[PDB]
Design a protein around this ligand. Structure first.
Ligand SMILES: [Cl-]
Ligand SMILES: [Cl-]
Ligand SMILES: [Zn+2]
Ligand SMILES: [Zn+2]
Lengths: 221, 221
């Protein structure tokens, strides 16, 4: 079963519903409601990642996709400046970002009914193999972010499990670096895509609130 | 008045409503309907560009933003592969891409109630001035696309009018190059953002249909 597989690798995984309930509740105490809140995402643009945005979309009205290949916010600081303009009058922003990974009905990681994450996996093979382009400009940027994780990916026990871990790690550092330059609440972690008739999962690894200044006002971790 | 300003620079400009009516009608004869059609956009992610997607959204059900800074589809070929997965069962795709540009109530180009397009303008100053970055990775890619247009931008009569022309041109070449590698219908041109209480405009410069093979099945220009 897939449940067993997920709970094994990631015992702290919450269901999408649990994730959204968890987050909405907490952010309620800080002024976050349905129509004063910009939901921004930085998830991979493969369609399997849609369920998380959909679930969060019901609770928060307007939405902004900031996600590039593999879930990287490679719009960078300029892209962030664009997002800030979508924030409602007197509003705040919620940023959900994360890597993602498929796990099949047969409990297999790195896939779900093809490769998932396709883009991460691709770049994984490219950086490990070499451990031993305006037409694909972003895939190259994904490779660059994954280069420092090469050793870990070859040394890894199970690679299709270590991969989204490594991708979230690189995303986290980037997002932090970007926010620091530029209230905004931040959810970060690992998205887990399961078979259609089955709830998806999210591993929370960062849940905090920052100010217009740039310092961490709260940390729910 | 803004109308006079628009009609001057771009006498062939259609209103959003006209654009959508025009396009939906034509594509009707080719099997494009509301729930079998993937609307993909490659527009700048500034919120002023939203009206075009909104208007096209009413006619075509599901939507996919493929647009990066300035309207460039810098997800490239990999990003395109992602999009193809959002295409409904037995469905086809409609790709709207374009540069955009603000024009004010006082008939001024390059702005509308700040700079618009902010990202294009920024890169314009950077390439002209020099005519005489994972934290901003895409803005750098915009600059690269605009480099060949530098001479034209300094030589230009009005720069805030020549700029979106130059940006569409560079987008067009890129989109074509990308499609050629990878039915899909393609609308390309210049988006014109006008004051809030006023309809926006679109200058059509490319309207065609391509096949899964890669050749142009139709050209409505
Ligand atoms: Cl499966
Ligand atoms: Cl104005
Ligand atoms: Zn992916
Ligand atoms: Zn713009």
């Amino acid at each position: 079963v897939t449940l067993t597989a997920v709970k094994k690798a990631f015992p702290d995984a919450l269901t999408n519903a649990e994730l959204v309930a968890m987050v909405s509740k907490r952010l309620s105490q800080f002024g976050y409601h349905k129509y004063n809140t910009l939901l921004a995402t930085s998830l991979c643009r493969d369609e399997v990642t849609r369920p998380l945005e959909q679930d969060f979309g019901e609770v928060y009205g307007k939405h902004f996709t900031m996600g590039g290949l593999a879930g990287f916010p490679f719009g960078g600081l300029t892209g962030f400046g664009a997002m800030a303009g979508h924030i409602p009058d007197g509003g705040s922003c919620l940023l959900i970002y994360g890597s993602h990974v498929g796990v099949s009905w047969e409990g297999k990681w790195g896939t779900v009914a093809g490769a998932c994450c396709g883009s991460a996996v691709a770049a994984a093979q490219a950086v490990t193999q070499a451990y031993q382009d305006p037409l694909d400009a972003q895939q190259g940027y994904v490779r660059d972010m994954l280069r420092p994780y090469a050793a870990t990916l070859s040394e890894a026990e199970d690679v299709m499990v270590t991969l989204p871990v490594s991708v979230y790690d690189a995303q986290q550092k980037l997002v932090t670096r970007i926010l620091d330059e530029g209230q905004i609440a931040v959810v970060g972690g690992i998205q887990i895509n399961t078979p259609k008739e089955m709830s998806d999962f999210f591993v929370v690894r960062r849940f905090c609130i920052r100010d217009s200044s740039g310092n961490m006002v709260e940390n729910f971790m």
